[PDB]
Inverse folding.
């Protein structure tokens, strides 16, 4: 019961943060005069995620000596684990940068609807890499989920919709791969979740900053690294840091496919709550989408 409530809490936080992240990230790119470098905000997230993970390792070990021993033996002591997790950190580095580029050129609703095609991609990656398997019924349910969530989800600055869509196309493919790669690495040994996060973000901060130099290196020398930062930009980075850590926790107790199903349910249930609580009005798209998600969960969760 205590493990279940903690599991349901991490899901609701992950989804609520994911909802507030795309709206806030959209806002910061379409209102500012001095526009900030999206590559820097991505990199600062990896620093903040790394620091919170180190904090959470100290809590998990619960001792200054065994906190030292864990970082010595697992992080520094295993160079092969760092080289492994440098792959999905490089994939995520691209993903997170494509996320900023997409929302700079597209609406949050438009982005959210298009980005649900990660669900098929994530199912495809899990079947190939992870050594799991799906029946024809469960394959029908994954697309039925995808269709259901797309229905649930339905600027004075210059924009480029087709560049935005190209970014989502890249981001969809990174999400399925890096998540399933991370789930594979996480669930292949006894190593702690916060150690796997630290091993990844160490590569993450290097690769993101390398990308930050290559992308906007000349213009940062003129403008500044923290050029265009604000309460809302630091808020976006804050949500990006928290949202990433929660997804790692969700992928531990759930999997990358069930992450889609569960998050869909959390969006459906919390909206139905807010319809009753806050008198929130909803569309027929949502009403329809909600049922597809419910059926897809039922069809997916059935014994072969
Ligand atoms: C910050 C946030 O809310 N991210 C959501 C993202 C979404 O892609 C964002 O637009 C940009 O990442 O989508 C979800 O998740 P998605 O699979 O794309 O996850 C991408 C984000 O999770 C972070 N991550 C992953 C594993 C790990 N061990 N540590 C991490 O920090 C990555 O660094 C990356 O930021 C989804 O499937 O709905 C859910 C995520 O919650």
């Amino acid at each position: 019961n205590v493990s279940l409530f903690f599991k349901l809490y991490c899901l609701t936080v992950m989804t609520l943060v994911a909802a507030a992240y795309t709206v806030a990230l959209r806002y910061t790119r379409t209102t500012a005069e001095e526009l900030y470098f999206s590559t820097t905000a991505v990199c600062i997230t990896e620093v903040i995620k790394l620091l919170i993970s180190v904090g959470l390792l100290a809590k998990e070990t619960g001792s200054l000596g065994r906190f030292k021993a864990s970082l010595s033996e697992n992080v520094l002591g295993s160079p092969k684990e760092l080289a492994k997790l440098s792959v999905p950190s490089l994939v995520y580095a691209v993903q997170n940068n494509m996320a900023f580029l997409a929302l700079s050129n597209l609406d949050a609703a438009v982005y959210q609807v298009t980005y649900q095609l990660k669900i098929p991609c994530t199912a495809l990656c899990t079947v190939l890499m992870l050594n799991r398997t799906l029946s024809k019924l469960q394959w029908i349910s994954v697309f039925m989920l995808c269709g259901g969530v797309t229905l649930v989800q339905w600027v004075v600055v210059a924009q480029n919709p087709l560049l935005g869509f190209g970014a989502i196309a890249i981001a969809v493919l990174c999400s399925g791969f890096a998540g399933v790669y991370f789930e594979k690495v996480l669930k292949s040994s006894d190593t702690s979740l916060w150690v796997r996060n630290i091993q990844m973000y160490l590569s993450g901060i290097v690769v993101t900053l390398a990308g930050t130099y290559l992308s906007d290196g000349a213009e940062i020398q003129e403008k500044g690294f923290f050029y265009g930062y604000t309460y809302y930009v630091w808020f976006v980075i804050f949500l990006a840091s928290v949202g990433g850590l929660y997804t790692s926790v969700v992928v531990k107790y759930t999997d990358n496919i069930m992450k889609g199903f569960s998050a869909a349910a959390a969006i459906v249930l919390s909206t139905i709550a807010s319809v009753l609580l806050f008198g929130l009005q909803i569309t027929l798209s949502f009403a329809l989408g909600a049922l597809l998600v419910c059926v897809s969960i039922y069809l997916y969760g059935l014994p072969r």
Summary: DSSP finds twelve helices and no strands in the chain. The two ends are 28 Å apart (CA to CA). The pocket of NCC is lined by residues 14, 17-18, 21-22, 49, 92, 96, 99, 118, 175, 179, 182, 197, 200, 240, 243-244, 247-248, 259, 263 (CB under 6 Å).
